[PDB]
Amino acid sequence: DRLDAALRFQQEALNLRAQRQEILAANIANADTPGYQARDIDFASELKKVMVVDLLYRVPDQPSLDGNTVDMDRERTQFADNSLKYQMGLTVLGSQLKGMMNVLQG
Amino acid sequence: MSGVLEGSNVKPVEAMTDMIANARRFEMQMKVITSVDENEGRANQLLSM
């Protein structure tokens, strides 16, 4: 359907933002697990792949003794950024749907 | 030598200096712990969108 092609990009971006949000929250929740590696996804490459998931390990900053590589500050900033981008995607998708609607209303 | 008993070799000057140093080090580490805890408490609000 042509309607899907117009809204495909924003829907895929929104779904990818939700998945990465879940991954970041999993990183936050498992901060205290000894031996847990902080995982993340490269948003742009996966968005290419879906439009046309694989988890990448985060490069550790400080060496802990229990093997936990989760850094609070980095993932807190990433979490806030992902929340903001999810809201922006919701706004853009809603604007596109509302425009398609006011075209029809009459 | 017979008729003499050997006592301990605990130097009291070293013990007193060790106690003073240990007390000061403990207080420094407690201060560092408090600073780190307060910093994390302030930092854990960013997550609010």
UniProtKB/Swiss-Prot annotation, chain A:
Family statement drawn from the similarity comment of this UniProt entry: Belongs to the flagella basal body rod proteins family.
Mutant lacking the gene: phenotype: Defects in flagellar assembly process.
Pfam families: Flg_bb_rod
Protein name, entry field: Flagellar basal body rod protein FlgB
Subcellular location: Bacterial flagellum basal body
Gene Ontology CC annotation, any one: bacterial-type flagellum basal body, rod
Role noted for this protein: Structural component of flagellum, the bacterial motility apparatus. Part of the rod structure of flagellar basal body.
Curated annotation (Swiss-Prot), chain B:
Highest rank taxon of the organism: Bacteria
Cellular location(s): Bacterial flagellum basal body
Oligomer status and interactors: The basal body constitutes a major portion of the flagellar organelle and consists of five rings (E,L,P,S, and M) mounted on a central rod. The rod consists of about 26 subunits of FlgG in the distal portion, and FlgB, FlgC and FlgF are thought to build up the proximal portion of the rod with about 6 subunits each.
Family: Belongs to the flagella basal body rod proteins family.
Protein name: Flagellar basal-body rod protein FlgF
Gene: flgF
